[PDB]
């Protein structure tokens, strides 16, 4: 919900994903490089607030221009036995060894967009042509050619 669009690059099975000490594997891994240039801090704040809410069984209130601060959410998260900033010690799926860097980890609301690759893939060797110009027709639905 913060303009962070992307496409699936590869799918790993349950046993190939990194896991935390309590066995939680992520559903989805995004690159750290998406954050600093675009400055979507709201993404990180939403992840932290959602983590606290799912731990405590509440729904976070992310209304803008309120008195919510990151430090209050961090205190709540620390009181529940997690690192106050949301980091987690995470293990490597392939070898089982600990990762040297801790991983920001939590639930976030994602939405699936209408643009799927199977509705865009198109190839043409030969096919219908226009009557006037005898050049390939236009359109993926009509088995057309590329300009």
């Amino acid at each position: 919900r913060h303009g962070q669009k992307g496409t699936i690059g590869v799918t790993y099975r349950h046993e190939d994903m990194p896991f935390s000490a309590e066995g939680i594997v992520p559903d989805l891994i995004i690159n750290p490089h998406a954050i600093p240039s675009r400055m979507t801090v709201a993404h990180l704040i939403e992840c932290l607030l959602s983590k606290v809410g799912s731990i405590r069984g509440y729904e976070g209130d992310a209304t803008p221009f309120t008195d919510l601060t990151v430090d209050a959410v961090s205190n709540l998260l620390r009181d529940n036995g997690y690192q106050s900033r949301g980091f987690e010690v995470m293990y490597n799926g392939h070898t089982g060894k600990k990762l040297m860097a801790q991983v920001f980890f939590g639930p976030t609301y994602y939405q699936r967009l209408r643009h799927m690759v199977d509705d865009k893939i198109h190839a043409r060797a030969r096919g219908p042509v226009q009557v006037l110009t005898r050049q390939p027709v236009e359109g993926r639905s009509r088995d057309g050619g590329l300009r």
């Binding site: 729904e59 309120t66 209050a72």
Partner: protein, 32 residues
């Protein structure tokens, strides 16, 4: 009776071995 009806000193005896304004209780019908 409830926790409120308990004596304040006895409430002080209830020590974990306050609500926050930004944690709502979930609903299903909403409003409008």
């Amino acid at each position: 009776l409830a926790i409120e009806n308990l004596h304040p000193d006895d409430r002080l005896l209830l020590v974990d071995p306050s609500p926050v304004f930004f944690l709502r209780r979930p609903q299903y019908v909403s409003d409008g």
